[PDB]
Structures are given as structure tokens and as C-alpha cells.
Design a protein around this ligand. Structure first.
Ligand SMILES: [Zn+2]
Ligand SMILES: [Zn+2]
Ligand SMILES: [Zn+2]
Lengths: 597, 156, 478
DNA sequence: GGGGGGGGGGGGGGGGGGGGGTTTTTGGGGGGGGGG
DNA sequence: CCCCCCCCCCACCCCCCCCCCCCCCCCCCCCCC
């Protein structure tokens, strides 16, 4: 007696699918998911009786936002919806459209059933999307086969590049040449359903409608190239790749170099032999049409900031695996904090170098600060394993080097003695001006590098000679060496009272399981976010008398500027908003140790 | 644009232009049989100064040193040539789609050879695609007059 | 009989078109799997009754007007739209087979043939497979009357339990000595080198990082012919790869098509395996920096073409290097004799300077061995029975997973032994003891402990690891 | 006064004609590195 | 420190399409019942 709305080719009723989804999208409780998964005894009513997707839709509607994330296992946890999971996997676009429409209907019905007043016109105007994810096993890109050609799949891989956003027409806009009447036409399966005659019966001219391109409505499309991860490849051949299409607010979900998951329908389409013909090649382009993407506190901060031993505590915590080099550790901690910037340029960078014998802990020290710092890099003074120090013009494009890439982070450079001369010259304007000047291919700019450098350098030959000065042992020239705030020597000279305890400390790491090593990054982050020290007036006189003292003892104003920056860094430590006399005194003292080399 | 018919001297005028070079479909003379045989009257028709300029994402605004994204900006009329290579600029105007005019059908041009949109009668079997471009109505830079009068008479 | 015969590709004359033939060759490249259409299915908007098009050709033309009588008998010009769900696709893959080095006549180029494989037979072929493929040899029109031609594959013939079978070798005994001798069994002597080379394969213990990888460089004369030893142990390892200095990762786009890919270098293929760097002294600075990053962080980084990444490289480096001026002078330093820098050499866990010394004793033995090979076309009898590679892989896997723990007695002993070595270090050469040599002693004794399948590392293992280190240090002088 | 038939216009379909469809060597400039 | 070398990068059939012609169909007008 009535028509039926059926998912084509399946005999699934769309009313049944709709209500099966509705009765989960409302009245599901998160406790059921722990029944499906392992560790079911961790169910807890005071956290798990929540109407999980009512909670999601409420926060979502208070944010007015269109998208819902949906772990597909939650369908299998709920009795009226376990079949909907199979329909979702096997017939995804229809089921997903049904789920989208159901989310919009839930939003509409909530503001009249839960009946709090809201802009019904806003919800009416808005589109809504489900993002199903964790659909199933992350089957290999190399394992896909033509049975997948309409199923919802899951992939993992590496983003190589993405197009700019591509406008994709959703509604064509037509205008009549004779009578200027206008009509909107939805694009159906990518085809413009052109009106052959003008709509208005009082005009009805044939072939008179014309497309007004910049009055059409466009969705956003983007194409991204995903390479097979080397974890999955067989050893003797190239990795594969798959192009994936991604739309609207999922555009620019990822960038070049991102390792990601995607959940998406595997799709295929024919391609033409030549554009002037309908003739199609007998095997289709394949792509995945994605619906979800994913990559790969203050109380304690203030509590720890009250401590008296904080300087030593934090300094030892940067590398507790390494035997005692404690003034180096203190210097590198102060480098992590850094000074302050000013408008007028003078900036907050602090720069450190380690020299002495090659076969010693300095490399591990650079590695540890690299692991700690938010956005630093590790490199060495010459060559390029597809990563190099200086900015460089190549094909035409400008590439930014490791110094420039380390903007706002510590740049760790090993083999700093063996650095090439053009690089040795280039370091001057980042040391002084924190920038590098580019003047080629019609582009002129001072490309701002804004990086603190931790250098690791070596003597000539196998051993450092401490009876000779640093300039006599090291290759790199004094005017560059002068720019470093703190400069250190680490030596392998035999002493059992050091070597035995080093060996016992080292060997004990294989047996054993205060050291806030994981809280260190959070402390550094909140300090850099919140604290901007200013110099006390008494600290002016302290800086002046200390500088004239070391001047009476070959100093330069670069040492005074260094003492300022170190004192400001010392004031970020302890979360102090104004540089104290003790901050100046420790900056002075540590520099007095360093300048004696 | 403005065109004179080949088989009679009548003139079509004020012909608006699409992205393709657009010629009249019908002769205004009720005597005349013409369609699509025309000569453009260069003197009666009006051109505008036009200049495409390519811009790239600012070096200090790229998030993690990846490639900068690019865009094509069209300047017209008095606004042309205010840009310069290496200059840092602020534009304002219209974000627009620009079709592949070859695919749309074009005199003297064989069409070109992402999936486009098709079915539109002008295309027949072909499918049309679009770039985004920015039609800028205004420009400023955000990154020797050696006579007294030309300097002084600009001051407050 | 023709389907039985294994032809070479150039023996496939045009007379064989349409016939079922079997071709012998090596697969030189393989396409990713793509869906070919068998039957296209069209929904009809204006009557619902679907229609179908079978496709027999490289190309087809899509249908538009509804040919079904449900439309046509009503003269209703309804519209057909293709549907993937109702269309029959078949798995398609294109491969190229090339005739083997023995099949090529004198002075000719090795000829090659496209293979088309459909259905369940897909991805039975990998590049580098040497294979007999039966198929229908067929033409395809594009030239005029010249034809494109391919082989429609039909059948594939490839040319080429453990957790208890490992107990055969465990109970057989003398496992370290015999397994060491079984690396390149025909190669005389150098059993200290062979003993060290094994501990690459079993590795040390990693811990939260502390690292399992062990690295060794085989320096000295080229007349020792160390390349074959690298080749041998590369084949032993389940994951390793053999390379030449003549390694870095790069965005190596335009491989076959003009096309984007990221090339993980051999150091990334060697992730969780051995990278065998032959001609190690000949490498360039990009590869030197690549080796530096993997030997320190066990990663190799990219900052190219917008791609910014670190690829995983948990790899052990086996290297072989040869001197300047052809032959090593023993009185001069390795730094005097060889192109490599000292800071890089310091990062290796073992350093072996295997020189070639003329000897009235050794040379007669080597000469008799080599002349036996020339006279009988096989190597002479070995005076012992070696373990074969797949059988020792049982043992190497068993030793790999049986990671030990450190002991207090070993802790005290390694400290005391290390301080004893630092007394000799107080003096010459770069071969003096360091914290990295102590880490080497620990990692190598752990490798020995793993090789004897123990739950704890032993002072026995420490003293043998110390013997290997001391022997290697003394080799730097002779 | 409504229905049928005849005649004229307008539209659609079918047919016919036409046009289009990358590595390897050589030279030059600039940059980088090594030896006296 | 200076100069020279050497290394790198770069330049004829088939389909789509358009025009022309013929027939058929639908409307309007006039006559007949
Ligand atoms: Zn109209
Ligand atoms: Zn005319
Ligand atoms: Zn139909």
C-alpha cells in the first residue's frame, strides 16, 4: 500500500537503519563499551552511566559545531545497533548519510523535547556530520583488492604532500540571458543538470540559461598522497602510495611528513583516454574518500617553585643518567630558560659550547636537551643527510636550514669544530642578529632564525691538551668562540675516584628501574609562557660592579649582555618576575667560571 | 566588446565578456542570416588594464617550515603594478573561481587534455574544472623626489 | 608439449601468439593491484531496471540512453549511471619479466615481456623472483600492423618445528665455536673476527634509551677480500642488506612514472637489522651524516620538499674499509692509512684491522685451497661440519628473544676490569678505553649471555667479551 | 453549440558531412675546497 | 691567504559535433450535424 525506502542492492530498510541508529545516538551509555572490551571489571557507575552521545551532542551544540567522532566499536557494544555496524562497513555512504541526517534530527528534536530555547533557524541552516573511526583492522595499503571497492576501510601511512584546496561545485547557479531570471541546480553525481528551457512559463526560451560560475556554491576538496609506511613494506621493492580525497573542515587535517590513520570508503572511478572523448580506460583509478583522520599542572608548578634546592634539582634532572658535570648541567638548564626580548634587536637566546675529548658524554648531553626542548633540532656542523645547517636555494625554491628550522628551540650541533667555512661565516648574523640574509631569485629578506645553539666540538686529533688554550686545541676561530655565553671542557683524563664512580653509575642503569624528568618539560613550558623578568634597580649596580671587576681582572660588553641574559633566565627559574641580586650573582659566578676556561 | 557582422555591416555592442573570449550568437538585423561570423571592432570595444600577480604565504607565518601555499591575484585598472617582486602586501577584493577556459570551448584553441563537472551543453562530453583566484580591487605594501616643492607640498 | 617447455623471452617468436606457453625469467618490476572491469553495471534513473556492459578491451565507451525495453518500449529516453557496487571488477596487475643472464646471447641486451595477471593469481609475482610463468601469449593493438604483446598469466612456478629443532643444536654443543666457524665456512682463520661478527646478529639488551645494536668495522688490506665475509653475514641475518660507500634517505621522486615517493635508504631497510657497508672509506658527506644520525639516535631525518620526518633506523652497522695507496702500512695509524675520520671510528664497538701478511706457511694453504676450487669446481672438505643458514636462524631467533638481566657480581667485575684497562689507557692510538668501551663490554657480554640462552649475564661472558675487545685492540698494531 | 476534419506551422529526429587527435652531452657561470 | 681546480646546476579511422531536411504531430479554424 506504500513505498519503501531501501538501501539499494541490500533490502535494508532505511527506516529501520534510522531508528537503530537513533536508539544508540540517544540512550547509549558508556558502561556498555567496557563490557565489549577487555578489563570489564573497571566499569564504574558514577563515570559510566553517562548518556555518552547526549553529552557529546550537548557540548557540540554549545559549541555550535557540525562534527561528531564515533568509535565504531560502540555500535557493537549496543544490542539494537550491532547490525548497523555491519551495514556501516558494507554500505557506508548510505548509512553515513542516514547517520548525518539523524544527528541533525537529534539536534532539532532536543531543543523542542529537552525544550530549552535555542536558534532553531541556526540548526536548520547547519549541516551535520558523523566521523566513524576505528572501523576495523588497519589492513595494508598493499593488501587492498577489488572486493573493497565500496567498503569503509582503515589505513595507516605517511603524508607526502597535499594539493591546495580545490573548489568542488555543490550547486550550479544559472541565469537566463533574455529575462535575467535565476535558478539554483544541485550537482548530482558530479553532473550539471542543465535546464534546457527557462523555468518561467512567461519566458520559456530554449537554450537561454547560462552558468554564472562565481555565483555557484562550492564545497572544499583536497587530494593528499599517502605513502605506505616502511613498517609494512616487503624488503625488496618500493613502497606503494594511495591518493586520498578529503573534504570541508577535514581539509588540512595533516601536513607533509605526518604519519596518520584515515578511516574512509575505498572508492574507484574510471579515467579518460583523451578529454575530447567519452572513451574510458578499462581499469579504474582507486582512492579512499575519508571520513575521519588522526595522527600517529599549575598547582604542582607553584608547589615545586617554592623549593630552595630547585636550581640543583632541575639541573641534575636534565640528564641523571650522566655522571657529574654539574656546572654544565646548570648552564644548559639556564639555556633552556633563556632571557627576554625587547622592542626598539636584543633577544632572549643563550648559547653554549662543549669541547674537550671526543669520546665523552657531550653527545648524550646534546641528545637529552634535544629530547627536552619543544621545537629544537639535532644536526652536525657539515654536510646534509637531506638536512643541513644553512638556508639554501634549490629546485626553484628556498629551503630553510636546521638553524632556521630551530626557530624558538635549541639547535644542537655536533662536530662543531669540523664545520665548513661558509657555515662558520653564516653563524655570525644568527649569533648577533638572530637572522640570516637572503638576496636571490627576486626575494630579499632577513630570514629570522631565533635559535639558541648548543654546540659540541672537539680537539684536533684524538686527545685534548689542557696545557694549551682552547683556541690552540680547537679548530674553530676565536671570534666565533667568543660569541658563546658559556663554554665548557669535558675530558677523559684518568682518575679512579671519578672513573670508578662513573662506571658504577653507568652499570647500575642496567639493574635499577627526586628526579622530575617528565615534569621538567611542563615546568619549562609554563615558565616560558608566564614569566618575563625585568631587571631590579639594585641589580643595575650589581651588574656594573661585577662587570668592572672582571674588566679589571679583559672583558667586553658582550659579557655584560650575557650576564643580563643569564640573570633573566635565572629569574624565569623559580618563576620570579623580577631579576634579583642573587640572580645577577649566579649569572656572574657561572660566567666567571666559564671565561677562565 | 563590439562586433560587426561579416555578411552585413550591422554592429553588436556592449557585449559583456565571460572568462572566454565571447562573441555574439545572433545578428541584430532581422534580415540577416548570420551566427558566429564576426569581426571585433577594436576602436569601439573597451579594454581594461589587467595584471596577474602570484603571492605566497608569508615566511614568518608558515607553521613548521613546510612549503608555503600560493595564490593567483588579478589586479585591474588603476590598481595594476602597485605590487612588486619580493614585496609584502595586503590586498582586498573578491575570492573567485576561474574555469579552465580551454575546456570550456575557445576560438582557435584545442581543449586541454581532478575530475570536473559535466553535462553543461557548452561542454558536450568535456568536464569543467576551476582554479581559485583573488580579484583584487585594492593594494598596499606593508613591507628621489629631489626638489623642495615636490617634497614640501606633500607634508602636513 | 609446448606449454611444458621453459622458453627464454627472445625465443618467444611471433608464431607463438595465441598459444599457452611457459616462459623462464626474472621479474624486474611489478605494478600495484588495480581493479579492471569485467561487467559494468548501470542503474537507470527513470525506470530502475539496471543494464550491463561486458568489457573485452583496453578501453570502452560508457552507455547513456536506457536500452532496456522497460524504457525503450515506452520510448522513454532514460539515463544510465554507472554503479561500482553492482559492477563486477576483477583484480588486475601488470608485471614485466626479463630473460636471465644465462639466456642473453653474446653482446645482446636482455629482452623483456609484459605479464598480465588476473583474478586469484594476482600478487603471486614479486620483483626479483626467478620464475616459470605459464600463460597465453597474446597481442594487443596500439605503428600500423606492428603489435604490442603480453603474456596472460595462468600458472606460476617459483625457483626458490623450530622451537624444538633448535634443541638439536643446543644438545649438539660447542655452539659458539661451531656457529662462528660457520660464518663463511670456506674462509680460513680469523675466528676472532667471526666470533665478533656473530654478536652483531644476537645483539645486546636495550632498556629505558640503552641500545641493543653492536657495530664493527673491518679495516686493512683489500687483499683479504673482506667483501665476501660481509656478503655471507648479510645473508645470515633475517633483515639485513648489503651496500657500498660508492645510504642516506631522500625524496627520490620520478621513479618510473613522474611520481612522488620518499626513499628510505638502506639504513632504514636495515631497521631492526644489519646494514653491511662495503667500501666504507669511499662514502660522501651526505652518507657520513646519515651514518652519524643512525649510529647515534637510531633515526634518519628529512627536511626536504616540505616533508619533515624522522625515519626509524634501529640498525647495527657492519663496515669494511680499505687503505689509501692500496696497502696498509702497519707502523702508521689507521687514521694515516684510511680515509675515515677518527670521531666516527670512535663510535664503533669493535674495530678489527685484518692485515694481509705474506707467509711461507699460510700462502701454500691458500694456494692449495684456491687451486682445488679451480681444479674440481667446488670448495675442499672443511675438516668440520658447518651449520646451514636457515638452521642457525632458529638459534639466532631463540638467542634474540632470550634477553638476560644484569647481576651484581658482573657489575663489580666490569667496573674492576674497566679500571684495569684505563691504567693502560693512561699513556699511541685511539684504541684506549672509554665509557663507550665499557658500554661495549656490557653490550657484548650481554650478547654472549643471549647466545648461551641464559637468564643472567656471567663473568664468563664478560671475560670473553673483554678478550674480544683486547684482541681487537691489539689487531690495530698488527 | 459542439465535434470532426483539414490545413498549416513548429519541433524533433535522423542522417550526412567534417574535423581533430627523459637522459645525455656541451658549454658556461658560480661556489666551494685543497695545496703551496 | 691566494689561486686554481673541480664540482654543481642549468638549458587513417573513429567520435564528437553540427547542420540540414523531412515528416509528423498538435493546434486552430471552419463547416456540418
Ligand atoms: Zn527566461
Ligand atoms: Zn548580419
Ligand atoms: Zn530505463
Amino acid at each position: 500500500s506504500e513505498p519503501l525506502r531501501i538501501i539499494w542492492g541490500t533490502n535494508v530498510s532505511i527506516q529501520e537503519c534510522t531508528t537503530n541508529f537513533r536508539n544508540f545516538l540517544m540512550s547509549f551509555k558508556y558502561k556498555f563499551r567496557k563490557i565489549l572490551d577487555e578489563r570489564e571489571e573497571f566499569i564504574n557507575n558514577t563515570t559510566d552511566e553517562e548518556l555518552y552521545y547526549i553529552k557529546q551532542l550537548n557540548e557540540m551544540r554549545e559549541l555550535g559545531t557540525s562534527n561528531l567522532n564515533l568509535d565504531a566499536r560502540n555500535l557493537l557494544a549496543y544490542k539494537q545497533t550491532e547490525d548497523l555496524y555491519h551495514q556501516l562497513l558494507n554500505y557506508p555512504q548510505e548509512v553515513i548519510s542516514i547517520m548525518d541526517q539523524t544527528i541533525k534530527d537529534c539536534m532539532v528534536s532536543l531543543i523542542v523535547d529537552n525544550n530549552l530555547d535555542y536558534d532553531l533557524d541556526e540548526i536548520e541552516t547547519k549541516f551535520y556530520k558523523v566521523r566513524p573511526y576505528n572501523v576495523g583492522s588497519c589492513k595494508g595499503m598493499r593488501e587492498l583488492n577489488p572486493n573493497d571497492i565500496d567498503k569503509l576501510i582503515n589505513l595507516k601511512g605517511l603524508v607526502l604532500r597535499s594539493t591546495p584546496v580545490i573548489p568542488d561545485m555543490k550547486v550550479a547557479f544559472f541565469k537566463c540571458n533574455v529575462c535575467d531570471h535565476t535558478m539554483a541546480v544541485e550537482i548530482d553525481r558530479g553532473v550539471i543538470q542543465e535546464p534546457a528551457r527557462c523555468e518561467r512559463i512567461d519566458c520559456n526560451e530554449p537554450n537561454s540559461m547560462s552558468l554564472i560560475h562565481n555565483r555557484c556554491s562550492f564545497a572544499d576538496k583536497q587530494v593528499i598522497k599517502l605513502q605506505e609506511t616502511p613498517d609494512f613494506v616487503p624488503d625488496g621493492q618500493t613502497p606503494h602510495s594511495i591518493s586520498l580525497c578529503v573534504y570541508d573542515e577535514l581539509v588540512d587535517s595533516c601536513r607533509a611528513g605526518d604519519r596518520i590513520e584515515v578511516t574512509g570508503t575505498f572508492r574507484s572511478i574510471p579515467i579518460r583516454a583523451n578529454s575530447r572523448q567519452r572513451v574510458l580506460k578499462s581499469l579504474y583509478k582507486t582512492y579512499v574518500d575519508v571520513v575521519h583522520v588522526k595522527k600517529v599542572d599549575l598547582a604542582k608548578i607553584r608547589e615545586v617553585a617554592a623549593r630552595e634546592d630547585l636550581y640543583s634539582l632541575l639541573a641534575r634532572s636534565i640528564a641523571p643518567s650522566i655522571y657529574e658535570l654539574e656546572d654544565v648541567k646548570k648552564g644548559i638548564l639556564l639555556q633552556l630558560f633563556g632571557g627576554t626580548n625587547k622592542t626598539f634587536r636584543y633577544r632572549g637566546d643563550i648559547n653554549i659550547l662543549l669541547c674537550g675529548d671526543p669520546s665523552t658524554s657531550k653527545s648524550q648531553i646534546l641528545q637529552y636537551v634535544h629530547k627536552i626542548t619543544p621545537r629544537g633540532v639535532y644536526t652536525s656542523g657539515k654536510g646534509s643527510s637531506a638536512v643541513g645547517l644553512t638556508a639554501y636555494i634549490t629546485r626553484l625554491v628556498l629551503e630553510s636550514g636546521a638553524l632556521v628550522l630551530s626557530d624558538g628551540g635549541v639547535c644542537c650541533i655536533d662536530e662543531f669544530d669540523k664545520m665548513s667555512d661558509s657555515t662558520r661565516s653564516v653563524l655570525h648574523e644568527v649569533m648577533e642578529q638572530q637572522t640570516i640574509s637572503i638576496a636571490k631569485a627576486g626575494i630579499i629578506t632577513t630570514l629570522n632564525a631565533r635559535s639558541s645553539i648548543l654546540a659540541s666540538a672537539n680537539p684536533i686529533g684524538s686527545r685534548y691538551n689542557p696545557n694549551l688554550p682552547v683556541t690552540e686545541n680547537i679548530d674553530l676561530p676565536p671570534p666565533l668562540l667568543s660569541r658563546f655565553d658559556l663554554v665548557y671542557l669535558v675530558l677523559d683524563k684518568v682518575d679512579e675516584k671519578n672513573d670508578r664512580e662513573l662506571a658504577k653509575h653507568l652499570t647500575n642503569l642496567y639493574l635499577e628501574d627526586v628526579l622530575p624528568v617528565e615534569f621538567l618539560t611542563m615546568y619549562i613550558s609554563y615558565a616560558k609562557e608566564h614569566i618575563h623578568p625585568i631587571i631590579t634597580e639594585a641589580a643595575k649596580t650589581e651588574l656594573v660592579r661585577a662587570y668592572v671587576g672582571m674588566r679589571k681582572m679583559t672583558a667586553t660588553t658582550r659579557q655584560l649582555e650575557s650576564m643580563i641574559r643569564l640573570a633573566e633566565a635565572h629569574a624565569k627559574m623559580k618563576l620570579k618576575n623580577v631579576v634579583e641580586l642573587e640572580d645577577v650573582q649566579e649569572a656572574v659566578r657561572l660566567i666567571r667560571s666559564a671565561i677562565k676556561d | 566588446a563590439s562586433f560587426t557582422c561579416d555578411m552585413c555591416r550591422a554592429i553588436v555592442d556592449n557585449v559583456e565578456q565571460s572568462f572566454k573570449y565571447t562573441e555574439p550568437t545572433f545578428c541584430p538585423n532581422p534580415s540577416c542570416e548570420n551566427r558566429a561570423f564576426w569581426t571585433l571592432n577594436v576602436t569601439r570595444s573597451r579594454f581594461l588594464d589587467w595584471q596577474k600577480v602570484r603571492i605566497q604565504e608569508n615566511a614568518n607565518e608558515i607553521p613548521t617550515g613546510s612549503m608555503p601555499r600560493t595564490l593567483d591575484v588579478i589586479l585591474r585598472g588603476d590598481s595594476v603594478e602597485r605590487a612588486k617582486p619580493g614585496d609584502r602586501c595586503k590586498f582586498t577584493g573578491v575570492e573567485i573561481v576561474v574555469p579552465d577556459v580551454t575546456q570550456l570551448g575557445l576560438p582557435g584553441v584545442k581543449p586541454s587534455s581532478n575530475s570536473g563537472v559535466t553535462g553543461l551543453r557548452s561542454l558536450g562530453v568535456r568536464d569543467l574544472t576551476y582554479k581559485i583566484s583573488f580579484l583584487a580591487c585594492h593594494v598596499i605594501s606593508i613591507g628621489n623626489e629631489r626638489d623642495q616643492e615636490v617634497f614640501l607640498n606633500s607634508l602636513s | 608439449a609446448i606449454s611444458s617447455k621453459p622458453l627464454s623471452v627472445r625465443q618467444i617468436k611471433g608464431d607463438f601468439l595465441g598459444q599457452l606457453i611457459t616462459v623462464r625469467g626474472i621479474i624486474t618490476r611489478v605494478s600495484d593491484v588495480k581493479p579492471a572491469v569485467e561487467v559494468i553495471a548501470y542503474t537507470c534513473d527513470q525506470c530502475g531496471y539496471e543494464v550491463f556492459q561486458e568489457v573485452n578491451s583496453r578501453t570502452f565507451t560508457p552507455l547513456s540512453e536506457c536500452t532496456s525495453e522497460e524504457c525503450s518500449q515506452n520510448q522513454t529516453k532514460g539515463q544510465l549511471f554507472m554503479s561500482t557496487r553492482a559492477s563486477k571488477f576483477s583484480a588486475f596487475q601488470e608485471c614485466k619479466i626479463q630473460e636471465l643472464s644465462q639466456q642473453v646471447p653474446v653482446g645482446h641486451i636482455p629482452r623483456s615481456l609484459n605479464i598480465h595477471v588476473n583474478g586469484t593469481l594476482v600478487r603471486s609475482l614479486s620483483p626479483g623472483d626467478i620464475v616459470d610463468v605459464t600463460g597465453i601469449f597474446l597481442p594487443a593493438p596500439y605503428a600500423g600492423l606492428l603489435t604490442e604483446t603480453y603474456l596472460e598469466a595462468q600458472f606460476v612456478r617459483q625457483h626458490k618445528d623450530v622451537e624444538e629443532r633448535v634443541m638439536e643444536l643446543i644438545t649438539s654443543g660447542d655452539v659458539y665455536n661451531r656457529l662462528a666457524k660457520s660464518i663463511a665456512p670456506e674462509i680460513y682463520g680469523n675466528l676472532d673476527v667471526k666470533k665478533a661478527l656473530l654478536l652483531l646478529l644476537v645483539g645486546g639488551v636495550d632498556k629505558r634509551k640503552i641500545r641493543g645494536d653492536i657495530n664493527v668495522c673491518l679495516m686493512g688490506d683489500p687483499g683479504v677480500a673482506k667483501s665476501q665475509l660481509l656478503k655471507a653475514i648479510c645473508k645470515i641475518s633475517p633483515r639485513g642488506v648489503y651496500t657500498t660507500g660508492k645510504l642516506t634517505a631522500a625524496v627520490m621522486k620520478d621513479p618510473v612514472t613522474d611520481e612522488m615517493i620518499l626513499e628510505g635508504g638502506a639504513l632504514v631497510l636495515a631497521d631492526n637489522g644489519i646494514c653491511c657497508i662495503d667500501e666504507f672509506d669511499k662514502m660522501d658527506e651526505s652518507d657520513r651524516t646519515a651514518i652519524h644520525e643512525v649510529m647515534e639516535q637510531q633515526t634518519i631525518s628529512i627536511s626536504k620538499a616540505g616533508i619533515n620526518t624522522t625515519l626509524n633506523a634501529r640498525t647495527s652497522i657492519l663496515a669494511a674499509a680499505n687503505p689509501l695507496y692500496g696497502r696498509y702500512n702497519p707502523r702508521l695509524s689507521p687514521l694515516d692509512n684510511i680515509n675515515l675520520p677518527a670521531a666516527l671510528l670512535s663510535r664503533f664497538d669493535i674495530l678489527f684491522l685484518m692485515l694481509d701478511i705474506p707467509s711461507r706457511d699460510d700462502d701454500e694453504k691458500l694456494a692449495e685451497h684456491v687451486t682445488y676450487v679451480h681444479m674440481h669446481n667446488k670448495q675442499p672438505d672443511l675438516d668440520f661440519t658447518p651449520v646451514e643458514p636457515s638452521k642457525m636462524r632458529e638459534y639466532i631467533a631463540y638467542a634474540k628473544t632470550k634477553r638476560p638481566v644484569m647481576s651484581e657480581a658482573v657489575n663489580d667485575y666490569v667496573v674492576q676490569a674497566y679500571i684495569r684497562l684505563r691504567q693502560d689507557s693512561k699513556r699511541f692510538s685511539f684504541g684506549q678505553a672509554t665509557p663507550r668501551t665499557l658500554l661495549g663490554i656490557i653490550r657484548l657480554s650481554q650478547a654472549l649471555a643471549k647466545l648461551r640462552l641464559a637468564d643472567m649475564v656471567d663473568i664468563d661472558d664478560v671475560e670473553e667479551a673483554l678478550r674480544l675487545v683486547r684482541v681487537s685492540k691489539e689487531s690495530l698494531y698488527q
